[PDB]
């Protein structure tokens, strides 16, 4: 447990280094840490994951204060337990006896004691431990054993969903907040422009609109959809939108294609159509921009609206390969 906890620290810090290395901001909330609950720990293939907040909800009910806030001592203390309810910042007791980090203590009670008991195959001890963690098994899932049991049993205790969902909502910036500190580097024009204020507000009423950059292929191809996130305003099918290329200058005429957006798709894995109108701060699989684009499509509905930064995807071309044909009539 000691060696495990260290393995989280050893990676979380090395991330925080790489967070603190880059770059301009200097926000304050850039760095990420376990005590916060940034940060979630888990397993994809198995499908279980937790956050340090979620285990503070369970430990506080079982002798602890305070619940709603405060409890970020999971990841520091440590706590001894048989002597008293109290925990101390000292690594050893007054006697001269070593202790844990309290993270080791909480992770022991379920996880380490689960896995060892599961590997021991003690089929009475597992039901007893199952009672301690508090449910559930139903139907033929009681009959399972081995790695497949551990996977299903874990999914129920800490469904990775719960950790991710909390993490995703909690410690992450909205499209309003994200555009706010990022509009200066995205938008090449002045910061005082009427576009950039609507980019900061996250507005639907104001001018339209967005970028694209990448483009997913279709099922029936041929053609391929335009994966773009709308930066201002609400698009909107069968409607005229200016298609400013990679290097279109507002004053200049080159790389501009005033065209109707054919249809709008909320992108959901394999599909799907539904609605015409779709506001800013939202991710869209457009179609009808495909012939009149390469790669990087700043789309606008006003002439003064500037092209966005090209990117800076970087990472070279690099390596060249020649391409001949065979027969030549298929050239």
């Amino acid at each position: 447990k000691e060696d495990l906890y260290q393995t989280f620290a050893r990676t979380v810090e090395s991330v925080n280094v790489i967070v603190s290395t880059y770059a301009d901001e200097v926000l304050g909330d850039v760095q990420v840490y376990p005590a916060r609950g940034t940060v979630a720990f888990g397993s994809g293939l198995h499908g279980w994951a937790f956050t340090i907040r979620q285990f503070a909800t369970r430990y506080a009910k079982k002798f602890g204060v305070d619940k709603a806030k405060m409890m970020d001592r999971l990841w520091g203390d440590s706590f001894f337990n048989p002597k008293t309810k109290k925990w101390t910042n000292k690594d050893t007791d007054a006697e001269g006896k070593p202790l844990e980090r309290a993270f080791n203590m909480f992770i022991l009670d379920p996880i380490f004691r689960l896995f060892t008991a599961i590997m021991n195959f003690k089929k009475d001890e597992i039901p007893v431990l199952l009672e301690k963690l508090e449910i559930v098994l139903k139907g033929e899932e009681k009959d399972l054993e081995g790695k497949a049991l551990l996977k299903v049993v874990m999914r129920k205790f800490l469904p990775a969903a719960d950790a991710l969902l909390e993490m995703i909502v909690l410690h992450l910036p909205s499209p309003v907040t994200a555009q706010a500190y990022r509009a200066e580097q995205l938008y090449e024009g002045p910061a005082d422009d009427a576009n950039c204020i609507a980019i900061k507000n996250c507005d639907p009423k104001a001018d339209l609109m967005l970028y694209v950059s990448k483009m997913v292929p279709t099922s029936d191809k041929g053609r391929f959809y335009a994966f773009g996130r709308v930066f201002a305003g609400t698009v909107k099918s069968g409607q005229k939108v200016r298609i400013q290329g990679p290097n279109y200058v507002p004053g200049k005429k080159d790389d501009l294609f005033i065209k109707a957006i054919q249809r709008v798709v909320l992108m959901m894995g394999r599909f799907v159509e539904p609605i015409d109108d779709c506001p800013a701060g939202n991710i869209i699989g457009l179609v009808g921009i495909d012939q009149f684009l390469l790669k990087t499509g700043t789309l606008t509905t006003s002439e003064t609206a500037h092209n966005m930064k090209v990117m800076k995807f970087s990472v070279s071309p690099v390596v060249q390969v020649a391409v001949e044909v065979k027969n030549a009539n298929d050239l």
Binding site: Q6, A9, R10, E13, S14, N16, V17, T21, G28, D91
Partner: protein, 195 residues
Amino acid sequence: EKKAEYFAKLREYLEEYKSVFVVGVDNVSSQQMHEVRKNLRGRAVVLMGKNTMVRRAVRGFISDFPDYEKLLPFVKGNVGFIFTNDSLQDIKEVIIANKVAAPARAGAVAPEDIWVLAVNTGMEPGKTSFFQALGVPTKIARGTIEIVSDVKVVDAGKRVGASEASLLNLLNISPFTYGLTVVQVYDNGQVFPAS
């Protein structure tokens, strides 16, 4: 030939200067003994010794002079002679006050438990990854590298690792600082413990 020239230079002391004042000067590690040679140059002179207990036993004969018989047993450890007639207490005060200090210990036995305190190092982030590879829990508390708790890195008796030594040189002093420490003081003859 190089023997007999050294036999001759040693006969000039104790016969000017009377107080010979000897010290090791086993581990130094210096460097700053040249600065001791510079600082002493004005008044005193230094002269180091191999098997020169044989030399002093040979000079201990003479017939007219027996007081070099006091010099014959005391040289224990790598030790060298720093003669000067100025006094002996003042030379003790100058030699103790100078000392080498300096880093450090890499790939050798630690004398005491190396305890590293918490609080900022005074750096920018980079080798915090290197820190946590050798069991020192660090967190970057806004820009500067900070250590999170007081921990024994290596205990007394154990050998110090090469990676461990490098972080102690940079940020967390060991400290394995030391210097020369007066062995004996003379004037006639005369045996004095130097304390």
